[PDB]
Amino acid sequence: ATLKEKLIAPVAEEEATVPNNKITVVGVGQVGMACAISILGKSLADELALVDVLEDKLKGEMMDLQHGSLFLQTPKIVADKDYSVTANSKIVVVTAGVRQQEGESRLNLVQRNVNVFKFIIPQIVKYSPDCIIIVVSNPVDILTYVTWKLSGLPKHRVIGSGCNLDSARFRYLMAEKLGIHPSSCHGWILGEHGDSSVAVWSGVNVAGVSLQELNPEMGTDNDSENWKEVHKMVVESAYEVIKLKGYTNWAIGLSVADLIESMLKNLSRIHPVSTMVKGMYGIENEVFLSLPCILNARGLTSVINQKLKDDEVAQLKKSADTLWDIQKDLKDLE
Amino acid sequence: ATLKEKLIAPVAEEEATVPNNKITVVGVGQVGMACAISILGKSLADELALVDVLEDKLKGEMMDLQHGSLFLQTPKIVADKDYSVTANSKIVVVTAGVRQQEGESRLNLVQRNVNVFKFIIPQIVKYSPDCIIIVVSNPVDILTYVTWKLSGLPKHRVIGSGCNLDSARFRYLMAEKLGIHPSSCHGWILGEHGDSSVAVWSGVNVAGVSLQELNPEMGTDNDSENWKEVHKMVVESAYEVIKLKGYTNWAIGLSVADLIESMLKNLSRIHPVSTMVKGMYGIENEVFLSLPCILNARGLTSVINQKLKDDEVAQLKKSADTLWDIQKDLKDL
Amino acid sequence: ATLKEKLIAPVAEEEATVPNNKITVVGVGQVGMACAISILGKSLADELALVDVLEDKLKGEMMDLQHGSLFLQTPKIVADKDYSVTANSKIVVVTAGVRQQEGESRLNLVQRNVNVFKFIIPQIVKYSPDCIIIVVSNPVDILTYVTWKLSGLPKHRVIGSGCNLDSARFRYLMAEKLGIHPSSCHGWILGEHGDSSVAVWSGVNVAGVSLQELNPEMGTDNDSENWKEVHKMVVESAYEVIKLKGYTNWAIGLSVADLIESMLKNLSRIHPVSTMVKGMYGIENEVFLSLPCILNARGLTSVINQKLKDDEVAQLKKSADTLWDIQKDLKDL
Amino acid sequence: ATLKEKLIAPVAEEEATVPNNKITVVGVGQVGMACAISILGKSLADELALVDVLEDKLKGEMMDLQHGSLFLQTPKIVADKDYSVTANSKIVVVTAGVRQQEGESRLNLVQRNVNVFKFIIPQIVKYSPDCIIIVVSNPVDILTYVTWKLSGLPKHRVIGSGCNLDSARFRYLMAEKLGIHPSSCHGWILGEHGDSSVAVWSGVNVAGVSLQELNPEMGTDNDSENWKEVHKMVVESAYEVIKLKGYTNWAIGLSVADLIESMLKNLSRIHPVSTMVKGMYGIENEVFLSLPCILNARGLTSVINQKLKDDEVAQLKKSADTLWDIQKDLKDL
Numbered sequence A: 001a002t003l004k005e006k007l008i009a010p011v012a013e014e015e016a017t018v019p020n021n022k023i024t025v026v027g028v029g030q031v032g033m034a035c036a037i038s039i040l041g042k043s044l045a046d047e048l049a050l051v052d053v054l055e056d057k058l059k060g061e062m063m064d065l066q067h068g069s070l071f072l073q074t075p076k077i078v079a080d081k082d083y084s085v086t087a088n089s090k091i092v093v094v095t096a097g098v099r100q101q102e103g104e105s106r107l108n109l110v111q112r113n114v115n116v117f118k119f120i121i122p123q124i125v126k127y128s129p130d131c132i133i134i135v136v137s138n139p140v141d142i143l144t145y146v147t148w149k150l151s152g153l154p155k156h157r158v159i160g161s162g163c164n165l166d167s168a169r170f171r172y173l174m175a176e177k178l179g180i181h182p183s184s185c186h187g188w189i190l191g192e193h194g195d196s197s198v199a200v201w202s203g204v205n206v207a208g209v210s211l212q213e214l215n216p217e218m219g220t221d222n223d224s225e226n227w228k229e230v231h232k233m234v235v236e237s238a239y240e241v242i243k244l245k246g247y248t249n250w251a252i253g254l255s256v257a258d259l260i261e262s263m264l265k266n267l268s269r270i271h272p273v274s275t276m277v278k279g280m281y282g283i284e285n286e287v288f289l290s291l292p293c294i295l296n297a298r299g300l301t302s303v304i305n306q307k308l309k310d311d312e313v314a315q316l317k318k319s320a321d322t323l324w325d326i327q328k329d330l331k332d333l334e
Numbered sequence B, C, D: 001a002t003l004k005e006k007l008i009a010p011v012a013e014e015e016a017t018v019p020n021n022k023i024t025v026v027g028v029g030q031v032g033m034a035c036a037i038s039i040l041g042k043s044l045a046d047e048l049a050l051v052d053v054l055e056d057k058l059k060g061e062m063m064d065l066q067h068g069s070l071f072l073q074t075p076k077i078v079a080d081k082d083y084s085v086t087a088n089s090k091i092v093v094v095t096a097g098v099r100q101q102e103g104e105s106r107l108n109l110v111q112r113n114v115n116v117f118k119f120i121i122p123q124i125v126k127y128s129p130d131c132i133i134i135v136v137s138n139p140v141d142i143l144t145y146v147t148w149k150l151s152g153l154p155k156h157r158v159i160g161s162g163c164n165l166d167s168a169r170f171r172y173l174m175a176e177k178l179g180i181h182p183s184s185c186h187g188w189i190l191g192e193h194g195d196s197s198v199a200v201w202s203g204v205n206v207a208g209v210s211l212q213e214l215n216p217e218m219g220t221d222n223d224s225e226n227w228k229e230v231h232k233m234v235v236e237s238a239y240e241v242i243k244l245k246g247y248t249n250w251a252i253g254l255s256v257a258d259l260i261e262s263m264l265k266n267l268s269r270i271h272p273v274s275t276m277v278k279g280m281y282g283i284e285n286e287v288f289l290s291l292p293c294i295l296n297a298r299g300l301t302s303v304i305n306q307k308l309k310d311d312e313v314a315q316l317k318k319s320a321d322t323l324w325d326i327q328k329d330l331k332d333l
């Protein structure tokens, strides 16, 4: 007999087991592995599946993770260029494609990553018809729209990682000013994950105290405390970090892990993420951008209606315009 | 014009949710709440259901937990005398029934808790036919047997918390001896969760160093390290705690959470838990007692075969005879 | 020639080291043990010390926790009626004294519990001159004032658990009404942890959306929603739970641990807790009541100044007057 | 008045605070950042400090982590090429230096990395004279010797990550073969973190069942289950992963965090880490290699005396000689 047979006496019939909280990460570059190690660190998946077109690095990442297995709570890790290995995922994180060169706008990536997504979105849905797709690749709003169209999935099951990260950055910068933890700072960056984002100044608050009531000039050009510069640091953050170390990955990895935690624990927590906002704030096309949404096990099930101020609605409309201007030229999507 | 309608714009239609990791704790006493609170503390459930016969205390425990929701990760906590609230439970923990008085053996409770289990076990399976059942009430070995029989579930879905806790206690006393963390001490108490439990001296080791190898008289009357008294402390521990504070609950609630974690995260980790050991070590009947078992999302799917020494095998058989003497006379199971 | 001596070769010479994260809990009742298990399950202490007047209960509780050690990350669990066991604690949580009977106001617990504190507090300060004290016993506001006075510690090191719990409950009720997690609902209950607490309607908000903007009648009697009813449920919660199960413990246990976590990890997070509010909002004496405060490793280092509406300031003055009426007549402090 | 002066009212005076649990990571490469994120994900440090000679990369890594601050529990993240930033670190991880090329042996990296450490280690002890140093850069056993000599620290505060990773790899492969979780398989890979590591077959056990009792040919060349091939996979794993992805980093980050947790929580758990083994198993010189060691807040305070088999003592003495043969010719330490 094998050692296994000497040691192990079966009590159950052997059986094909169906993973419950299977997560797939697509693309195992900087962002993909940031997301993967964050997912594994929070024990969010009982099965992790990696997909990339670079087979050698894909197998290497899978082996490195598997070696850390003693320290994790994920009994199965699997990797393949073939999407069969992503079968029955609850959530598929898509991180594949080109990124920004230094100084380069995410919008300049569209045409390349669109061609990438046309190949990978169908495959996801072939093997995980019931999954939630979290889109990360840039430009994230456009490609969330593109994934929704390409997948034929319900709007609530195709989420763009959107401004979660921008908002996190916002709240850290405010936190650094006030000397309090970021989670005790409340503020929402909305719209495009990019240059046209919108700082909802009217919502920024500590312990229910409106900071715009303490500082009516907050977010104007004439503001002795210059909070416009905080929104600007938020807008420029990606470019500065890309200039310094060539990419960003740890922050987005943590943010994606936060979204996943809200969905798999069925928490119904509110996250600023990218969704179709046709018919709100006067936007008239099928634009995707970040609004506050309720995330739980079903995916994105609600948007929060806000009492945006005039200049804030105007910024949001301009961001919607910038995005639709690129969306309207996107063909061959079904 | 409701504030919820003003505030929330729906994206998906509202649908009826079935929970993924629903756990039910039956009995909301010292042990039941210790279990519920350990379960919530580790975010093991997306839905906790409490069941008891005391409707007032039940709703009170439920409300106190819900008041804690801000600090938890469990969106739905519910409670009811009616087992319909437990439907679709992935795991059901049974803690309901009578407990030991001071000095009282756990076997003394069989008659009463059989009558208890004969009512609740059916109710459980009636509403969650695919669940795993973790028996905690005493005597837990005999009651896991009773539960297996009444439920009609496969033996891999009926689990008795067993000696997980005895072994935790053993490992604590070991680490106290040695100045190491309990998780770096290894040693298994097996057999009855009670006075007939067996210390597997041949398995006791620190970092793969057999301590019986550095002491062939480990566990005997002529033992300079006096390990026998450690096994006696493990055996007497419940009674001592019961005398000092009337009951035990914290360690067992942590134990049961450990088991649930291994099963919900599907780790196939090995725990000394109570299972049907017919055909092992010369035991000829469907005795339930604790052995090392592999636990995962299907439940208790394998037992580990061990090369027990003769004396260990003999204590194990004696423990099986103790239990089977009670089991063989139970009726209408 | 002992087992330890043969198994372990020393690399460092034996020294007595001081714990880095010692927490003491005073009182091992329902609340003290809910606190202990919450602290242990979050691995917030490297040494936990339990103190009570009931020596047997105390030993029993300590033994139960130690028997759970395998599942925990606290290598030292110690218990004694002598406060020498609490020496060098970073945080001391006081949960000792009488609690409310059915329907009893917390302010009716004053004299009894003041006497208790007069003995407990000096002992704490003798053995942990540098600790932060978290007062939990009721009335928590008046007793936080008492502890400040008895101890001689600075204001930033005497913290009343206060309305953290009240707000928790508020946020839970809110979440039930809106169908979101309590953490994504924001709203502040301030003032006394008791009947005169103040719902800060003007701060209530989801995702930065002022709920009193979508509903300016919020908190009045002309309200289509029943928000005042939410605040009333908050006020009555403790009585309702005391009536169903005789006491409350799980939610306050999680609240105390939430505060300890902000402190020990130095996060400077904002919690509504009881501090000395003389000179704010027109309050004229050294009243202790809950405001939103920045907590971290030094303790309670800032209060948040808020733009309370006139009715809110008025309710807060009414709270502070209820409390000061009791305080002013307190002697031998 | 500033917005912050309006918002925040001081309760305590301003004061400079010392981090309680500061960790510095030296080198922000693949491995350094893998360690960094592993430490942050476990909320192991209240202050994280990064050091590297690449100023731009250094600042960028720092900025990324800060932008993740909302999802974390480390309130202060600093970085600089100046070691002033590392002042008062409790633990300093050293990951800086050259790494293996494809197929290259770690020993071939000594010269270059000695020149690294001759600069780095004196800086470290300059600002944290009391710290523990975890050496990760390769060759890790040799560089741990170098760090010990250069730092003038006591042995219990210079720890090489050693075979913690090798054993992790060992256990994973073993779990893969048995269908159980790696934590329920026990097995020690000792000696050099390199081609001369020793597999301690006599300790390999599941639930205390010695697997070399069921397979007495385990470890030999005449073993139909080819356990020696498992040890081979452990020795080759780093080369295979380097050939596939260019380096390894995640598994060692997790291993390092596991060590840090044992020490900062004062758990006294046992890890296979590199210590100075002179006078052990016939080793005559100040060689560093991995044995099972107790780790707690003081550092590496104990080694576990093992009853190795003759062949295993042999492979360990070969490892020692392989190492000392390089160690002995190093200058200016």
Ligand SMILES: NC(=O)C1=CN([C@@H]2O[C@H](COP(=O)(O)OP(=O)(O)OC[C@H]3O[C@@H](n4cnc5c(N)ncnc54)[C@H](O)[C@@H]3O)[C@@H](O)[C@H]2O)C=CC1
Binding pocket: A026, A027, A028, A029, A030, A031, A032, A051, A052, A053, A054, A095, A096, A097, A098, A099, A100, A113, A116, A119, A120, A136, A137, A138, A139, A140, A161, A162, A165, A193, A247, A248, A249, A252
């Ligand atoms: N939403 C956000 O906040 C952020 C978005 N991003 C975006 O994330 C995406 C990736 O960034 P990095 O991880 O640093 O790039 P990376 O180059 O370091 O890794 C990208 C991965 O995509 C893989 N890939 C390309 N086409 C593929 C296909 N058809 N199938 C499978 N794999 C494919 C490449 O092999 C590579 O391994 C980029 O678009 C970047 O702009 C980056 C950071 C934050």
Ligand SMILES: NC(=O)C1=CN([C@@H]2O[C@H](COP(=O)(O)OP(=O)(O)OC[C@H]3O[C@@H](n4cnc5c(N)ncnc54)[C@H](O)[C@@H]3O)[C@@H](O)[C@H]2O)C=CC1
Binding pocket: B026, B027, B028, B029, B030, B031, B032, B033, B051, B052, B053, B054, B095, B096, B097, B098, B099, B100, B116, B119, B120, B136, B137, B138, B140, B161, B162, B165, B193, B247, B248, B249, B252
């Ligand atoms: N396996 C182990 O390691 C341990 C086992 N136990 C056992 O666990 C059990 C619970 O002990 P405690 O929480 O201290 O007793 P407890 O009195 O504090 O609570 C038991 C609960 O069971 C409830 N209950 C009784 N009959 C019921 C019925 N027919 N249906 C529904 N609920 C019913 C009672 O109302 C009570 O609320 C006892 O059997 C005790 O012996 C306790 C400690 C250790």
Ligand SMILES: NC(=O)C1=CN([C@@H]2O[C@H](COP(=O)(O)OP(=O)(O)OC[C@H]3O[C@@H](n4cnc5c(N)ncnc54)[C@H](O)[C@@H]3O)[C@@H](O)[C@H]2O)C=CC1
Binding pocket: C026, C027, C028, C029, C030, C031, C032, C051, C052, C053, C054, C095, C096, C097, C098, C099, C100, C113, C116, C119, C120, C136, C137, C138, C139, C140, C161, C162, C165, C193, C247, C248, C249, C252
């Ligand atoms: N602030 C809050 O949100 C809440 C506060 N509380 C308060 O917490 C306190 C404890 O309530 P419970 O734990 O349910 O009562 P509990 O009756 O279960 O007893 C707590 C312990 O107080 C101990 N004690 C009395 N004098 C002592 C002394 N001099 N030294 C050490 N221990 C002493 C008793 O022996 C008892 O063990 C009460 O004052 C209650 O009002 C309760 C719930 C919430």
Ligand SMILES: NC(=O)C1=CN([C@@H]2O[C@H](COP(=O)(O)OP(=O)(O)OC[C@H]3O[C@@H](n4cnc5c(N)ncnc54)[C@H](O)[C@@H]3O)[C@@H](O)[C@H]2O)C=CC1
Binding pocket: D026, D027, D028, D029, D030, D031, D032, D051, D052, D053, D054, D095, D096, D097, D098, D099, D100, D109, D116, D119, D120, D136, D137, D138, D139, D140, D161, D162, D165, D193, D247, D248, D249, D252
């Ligand atoms: N013990 C173990 O199991 C393992 C050890 N290692 C070792 O980790 C070390 C680093 O590996 P990687 O992160 O992949 O290489 P890396 O090439 O990605 O980054 C190494 C960092 O060291 C920095 N550095 C070089 N000299 C420095 C100095 N004097 N001060 C500060 N920073 C300096 C470089 O700037 C680089 O940024 C290597 O020696 C490698 O062998 C690698 C894997 C596991």
Ligand SMILES: CNCC[C@H](Oc1ccc(C(F)(F)F)cc1)c1ccccc1
Binding pocket: A011, A012, A013, B152, B153, B154, B155, B156, B276, B278, B286
């Ligand atoms: C895991 N599936 C089998 C579980 C159990 O089957 C068994 C029936 C008898 C025995 C026996 F006889 F003790 F060996 C052992 C097992 C059973 C019995 C009745 C209904 C379902 C399962």
Ligand SMILES: CNCC[C@H](Oc1ccc(C(F)(F)F)cc1)c1ccccc1
Binding pocket: C148, C152, C153, C154, C155, C156, C276, C278, C286, D011, D012, D013
């Ligand atoms: C950081 N907290 C400041 C220290 C505090 O000092 C006081 C501050 C204010 C007052 C009061 F209330 F104005 F009288 C009284 C004392 C104090 C109180 C008692 C003992 C020591 C310090």
